Each structure stands twice: as structure tokens, then as C-alpha cells.
Short mmCIF file of C-alpha atoms and ligand atoms in Angstrom, two decimals:
data_model
loop_
_atom_site.label_atom_id
_atom_site.label_comp_id
_atom_site.label_asym_id
_atom_site.label_seq_id
_atom_site.Cartn_x
_atom_site.Cartn_y
_atom_site.Cartn_z
CA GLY E 189 103.05 98.00 114.89
CA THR E 190 104.98 97.31 111.67
CA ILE E 191 108.61 98.47 111.22
CA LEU E 192 110.11 98.57 107.70
CA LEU E 193 113.89 97.73 107.60
CA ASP E 194 115.63 99.35 104.65
CA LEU E 195 118.00 97.00 102.82
CA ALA E 196 120.98 98.59 101.17
CA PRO E 197 121.64 97.86 97.44
CA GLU E 198 125.19 96.53 98.28
CA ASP E 199 123.75 93.92 100.73
CA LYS E 200 123.75 90.26 99.51
CA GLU E 201 120.15 89.79 100.79
CA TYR E 202 118.96 92.79 98.66
CA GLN E 203 120.83 91.28 95.70
CA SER E 204 119.35 87.74 96.09
CA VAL E 205 115.76 89.16 96.40
CA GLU E 206 116.38 91.35 93.20
CA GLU E 207 117.93 88.39 91.35
CA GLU E 208 115.02 86.12 92.27
CA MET E 209 112.55 88.78 91.06
CA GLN E 210 114.45 89.61 87.75
CA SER E 211 115.24 85.91 86.87
CA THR E 212 111.58 84.76 87.31
CA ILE E 213 110.08 87.09 84.67
CA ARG E 214 108.26 84.99 82.04
CA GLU E 215 105.93 85.57 79.06
CA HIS E 216 102.30 85.44 79.94
CA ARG E 217 99.49 83.93 77.77
CA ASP E 218 97.50 87.22 77.91
CA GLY E 219 100.44 88.85 76.07
CA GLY E 220 101.02 91.44 78.78
CA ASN E 221 97.38 92.62 79.13
CA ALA E 222 97.25 92.27 83.01
CA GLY E 223 100.80 93.28 84.12
CA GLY E 224 102.27 95.15 81.16
CA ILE E 225 105.12 94.74 78.68
CA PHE E 226 108.64 94.54 80.21
CA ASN E 227 111.72 92.22 80.34
CA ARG E 228 113.12 93.66 83.56
CA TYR E 229 112.13 95.76 86.58
CA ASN E 230 113.59 98.93 88.02
CA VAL E 231 113.84 98.02 91.76
CA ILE E 232 113.45 101.31 93.79
CA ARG E 233 113.87 99.70 97.27
CA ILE E 234 113.67 96.39 99.14
CA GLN E 235 112.29 96.50 102.66
CA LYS E 236 112.08 93.84 105.36
CA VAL E 237 108.70 93.82 107.21
CA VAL E 238 109.13 93.51 111.05
CA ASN E 239 105.92 93.00 113.10
CA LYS E 240 105.92 91.05 116.41
CA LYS E 241 102.24 89.93 116.25
CA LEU E 242 102.55 88.81 112.58
CA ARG E 243 105.69 86.89 113.43
CA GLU E 244 104.06 85.35 116.54
CA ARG E 245 100.97 84.26 114.57
CA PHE E 246 103.23 82.83 111.79
CA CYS E 247 105.50 80.90 114.29
CA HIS E 248 102.37 79.47 116.07
CA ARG E 249 100.86 78.14 112.81
CA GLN E 250 104.26 76.88 111.64
CA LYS E 251 104.51 74.71 114.74
CA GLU E 252 101.04 73.15 114.17
CA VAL E 253 101.80 72.39 110.47
CA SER E 254 105.19 70.83 111.42
CA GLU E 255 103.40 68.36 113.85
CA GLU E 256 100.99 67.22 111.03
CA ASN E 257 103.76 66.98 108.39
CA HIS E 258 106.41 64.65 110.01
CA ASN E 259 108.09 67.65 111.69
CA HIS E 260 108.54 69.59 108.38
CA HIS E 261 107.30 73.21 107.77
CA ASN E 262 107.85 72.73 104.02
CA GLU E 263 108.51 76.48 103.66
CA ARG E 264 108.93 78.29 100.29
CA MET E 265 109.77 81.82 99.33
CA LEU E 266 107.02 82.95 96.87
CA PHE E 267 105.78 86.14 95.26
CA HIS E 268 102.45 87.84 95.94
CA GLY E 269 100.84 90.84 94.29
CA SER E 270 97.65 92.45 95.61
CA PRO E 271 95.68 95.72 95.93
CA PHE E 272 95.53 94.79 99.73
CA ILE E 273 99.42 95.18 100.06
CA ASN E 274 99.21 98.01 102.64
CA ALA E 275 96.73 96.09 104.79
CA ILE E 276 98.93 92.91 104.45
CA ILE E 277 102.08 94.63 105.85
CA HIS E 278 100.10 96.13 108.80
CA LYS E 279 97.50 93.43 109.66
CA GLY E 280 98.94 90.32 107.93
CA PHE E 281 97.41 88.03 105.25
CA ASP E 282 93.65 87.56 105.63
CA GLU E 283 91.82 84.64 104.01
CA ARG E 284 88.52 86.59 104.65
CA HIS E 285 89.49 88.69 101.58
CA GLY E 286 87.33 83.60 91.80
CA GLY E 287 90.65 81.77 91.93
CA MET E 288 90.92 78.52 89.99
CA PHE E 289 91.46 76.59 93.26
CA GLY E 290 88.85 78.15 95.56
CA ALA E 291 88.85 80.74 98.29
CA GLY E 292 92.54 80.86 99.04
CA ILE E 293 95.55 83.22 99.03
CA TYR E 294 97.58 82.66 95.85
CA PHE E 295 101.43 82.70 95.47
CA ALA E 296 103.66 82.26 92.42
CA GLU E 297 107.30 81.27 91.75
CA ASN E 298 107.21 83.86 88.88
CA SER E 299 107.49 87.51 89.92
CA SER E 300 105.83 88.50 86.57
CA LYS E 301 102.76 86.38 87.60
CA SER E 302 102.33 88.33 90.89
CA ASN E 303 102.78 91.67 88.98
CA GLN E 304 99.54 90.94 87.11
CA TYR E 305 97.65 91.46 90.44
CA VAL E 306 99.23 94.66 91.70
CA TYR E 307 96.22 96.58 90.39
CA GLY E 308 93.68 93.74 91.09
CA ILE E 309 92.29 90.76 89.15
CA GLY E 310 93.40 90.86 85.45
CA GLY E 311 95.28 94.08 86.30
CA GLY E 312 92.03 95.96 86.97
CA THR E 313 91.94 99.40 85.33
CA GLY E 314 95.70 99.86 85.83
CA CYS E 315 97.43 102.60 87.87
CA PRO E 316 95.08 105.11 89.58
CA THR E 317 96.76 108.12 87.81
CA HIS E 318 96.93 106.95 84.17
CA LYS E 319 94.45 103.97 84.06
CA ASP E 320 97.41 102.14 82.41
CA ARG E 321 98.11 98.43 83.18
CA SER E 322 101.55 98.92 81.54
CA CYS E 323 102.42 102.17 83.35
CA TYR E 324 106.21 102.77 83.34
CA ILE E 325 105.85 105.85 85.64
CA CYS E 326 103.85 104.80 88.69
CA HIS E 327 105.60 102.89 91.47
CA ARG E 328 104.30 99.34 92.14
CA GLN E 329 104.75 97.09 95.15
CA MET E 330 104.88 93.29 95.49
CA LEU E 331 105.81 90.86 98.27
CA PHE E 332 108.39 88.07 98.45
CA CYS E 333 106.88 85.92 101.21
CA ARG E 334 107.73 83.00 103.58
CA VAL E 335 104.90 80.52 102.81
CA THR E 336 104.18 77.48 105.13
CA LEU E 337 102.99 74.84 102.66
CA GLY E 338 103.18 71.75 104.93
CA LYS E 339 101.70 68.79 103.17
CA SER E 340 100.56 70.04 99.74
CA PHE E 341 97.66 68.55 97.92
CA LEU E 342 98.29 68.24 94.13
CA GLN E 343 95.37 69.63 92.07
CA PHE E 344 95.22 69.40 88.27
CA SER E 345 91.66 70.56 87.59
CA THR E 346 89.77 73.74 88.52
CA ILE E 347 88.00 73.01 91.81
CA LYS E 348 86.36 75.45 94.25
CA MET E 349 87.88 74.46 97.63
CA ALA E 350 87.06 76.39 100.86
CA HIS E 351 90.01 74.83 102.86
CA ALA E 352 93.04 72.58 102.24
CA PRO E 353 91.85 68.92 101.79
CA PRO E 354 91.73 66.82 105.06
CA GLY E 355 95.27 66.07 106.34
CA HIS E 356 96.70 68.75 104.09
CA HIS E 357 97.98 72.37 104.54
CA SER E 358 98.13 73.78 101.03
CA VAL E 359 97.16 73.20 97.38
CA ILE E 360 99.57 73.22 94.41
CA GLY E 361 97.18 73.87 91.58
CA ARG E 362 98.17 73.50 87.92
CA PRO E 363 95.28 74.86 85.79
CA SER E 364 95.62 73.44 82.22
CA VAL E 365 95.09 75.85 79.29
CA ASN E 366 95.44 73.96 75.98
CA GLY E 367 97.48 71.32 77.97
CA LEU E 368 99.93 73.88 79.56
CA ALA E 369 99.88 74.85 83.25
CA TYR E 370 102.14 76.88 85.60
CA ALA E 371 101.83 76.14 89.32
CA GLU E 372 99.79 78.27 91.78
CA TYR E 373 100.56 77.79 95.47
CA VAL E 374 97.38 78.14 97.52
CA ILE E 375 96.91 78.49 101.31
CA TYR E 376 93.52 78.88 103.04
CA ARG E 377 94.84 80.49 106.32
CA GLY E 378 96.55 83.90 106.30
CA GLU E 379 98.85 82.80 109.17
CA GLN E 380 100.50 80.39 106.73
CA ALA E 381 102.35 83.33 105.00
CA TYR E 382 104.61 86.12 106.33
CA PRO E 383 105.20 89.24 104.07
CA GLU E 384 109.04 89.01 104.47
CA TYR E 385 110.08 91.46 101.71
CA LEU E 386 108.24 94.56 100.45
CA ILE E 387 109.63 95.37 96.97
CA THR E 388 109.00 98.89 95.52
CA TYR E 389 109.63 98.92 91.74
CA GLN E 390 108.63 100.08 88.26
CA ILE E 391 108.26 97.83 85.19
CA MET E 392 110.80 98.95 82.47
CA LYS E 393 109.82 99.81 78.85
CA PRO E 394 111.83 97.48 76.54
CA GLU E 395 113.95 99.32 73.93
CA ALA E 396 111.90 99.66 70.66
CA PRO E 397 112.26 96.64 68.25
O1 XAV T 236 100.30 87.09 93.52
C1 XAV T 236 99.00 86.71 93.21
N1 XAV T 236 98.04 87.51 93.70
C2 XAV T 236 96.74 87.10 93.43
C3 XAV T 236 95.62 87.97 93.85
C4 XAV T 236 95.73 88.89 94.93
C5 XAV T 236 94.65 89.72 95.28
C6 XAV T 236 93.38 89.62 94.58
C7 XAV T 236 92.27 90.57 94.84
F1 XAV T 236 92.34 91.59 93.99
F2 XAV T 236 92.33 91.06 96.09
F3 XAV T 236 91.07 89.95 94.59
C8 XAV T 236 93.27 88.69 93.55
C9 XAV T 236 94.34 87.86 93.22
N2 XAV T 236 96.42 86.06 92.65
C10 XAV T 236 97.44 85.29 92.16
C11 XAV T 236 98.78 85.57 92.50
C12 XAV T 236 99.98 84.72 92.05
S1 XAV T 236 99.47 82.99 91.65
C13 XAV T 236 98.09 83.42 90.50
C14 XAV T 236 96.93 84.13 91.32
ZN1 ZN T 237 100.60 105.44 86.07
#
């Protein structure tokens, strides 16, 4: 099964994962409705997910994508937030489980974008205990994943795709809202992502203005 490797805070790998998570916080158009109000996270722990079958399935797909993309995986480290997090670390990503780019598995460069989905779409009803989307008490988890993009198809309008377009492996969707769009990285096969880092954290309440 799955083994969780515990990274130490003094490790460079722990520090780079934290830095990527802290530096990619941005303001969201919903004004903090989904993920809460914060400028920084309190990182509780960073764990490396080790699972032989998930790694085998990921290697196998990686090789296929490489062959169709002039021997390039086109791998990127991206954030993912989901109420399925526990099933992801044990069984892997599952495309069988509304998005602006069709029935895919969505990844963001912004950690704050993935934080909006910890409790489900639009932040759901928030944490189970306080029903608070901006809870500063309850521990949250998000993933920092290896994502095999291969040949990405560039999408600029909302389209309901079932699979990557012919000859392609992923979709880079930019959904325009009043002319502004942040990229969403979409895969349509769970084996095209590995849940490399499990980050346990809290959002932090900014000091009163
Ligand atoms: O990290 C993300 N997660 C999800 C996401 C995960 C699980 C679920 C569901 F609750 F299971 F239906 C819904 C959406 N969507 C997005 C991103 C980052 S890019 C923007 C879209
Ligand atoms: Zn709570």
C-alpha cells in the first residue's frame, strides 16, 4: 500500500515545497468566499507519498505520452485540492470522479486556487466541524503533484471535452472573466498525475487592518 515519508522542516525539499506553496498565493475574484481570507499558510507537515502501483501506473503512462510528444514527458509540478484527497493518496487519481474544460482532473500553478477545493466545489459548506470556509482551526490538506502534460491543447473558451483533443495529452484552459483568465491544467486520465507531496496546513488569519 501507500507509505508516507515524513520530510523534516530543515530539509531543502521541504523548504522548496513550502516556498512554492507560500509564493503562489494570489487574490481570488470571489474575494475569499471559497477558500477563505489569508496571506500565508501555517504548514504543519510535508509528506512524500510512496506507492509502488501508483508509481508503476504513472511510469507506464509517462512512456506512452513521451512517444507521442517527440520523446518529451512535458512534466510540471502543480497543486491540487480535493475532498477525494485520502482516496487519491491510496488509490491514485481517478478520472471517473462541471469544470470549465470538461470531465477532467484540474491542476493550478497557484496553491490558493487549489485551496478553494479542499472542501469541494466553491468551498462547499466549509470544514465539517464549524461549517466555515475560512476556518483557521481545522487542518487542511492539498497535493503538490507531478503532472504529465505531454502535448497540451490551448483552450480559450469554455468547452465540455470528454478527453484531450486527438494527438494531445492535456488541456491548458484559460477561462475569460471580463477579459482576465488564469490557466487551468487539465488531464483526462488519472495515470497522468502522481500525488508527490501531501501538505497538511492551516490558512492563517491576517492581522486586523
Ligand atoms: O485543485 C483543484 N481542484 C479542483 C477540484 C477537485 C475536486 C472536485 C470535486 F469536489 F471532487 F468535485 C472539484 C474540483 N478543481 C480545480 C483545481 C485547481 S484548477 C481550478 C479547478
Ligand atoms: Zn473548522
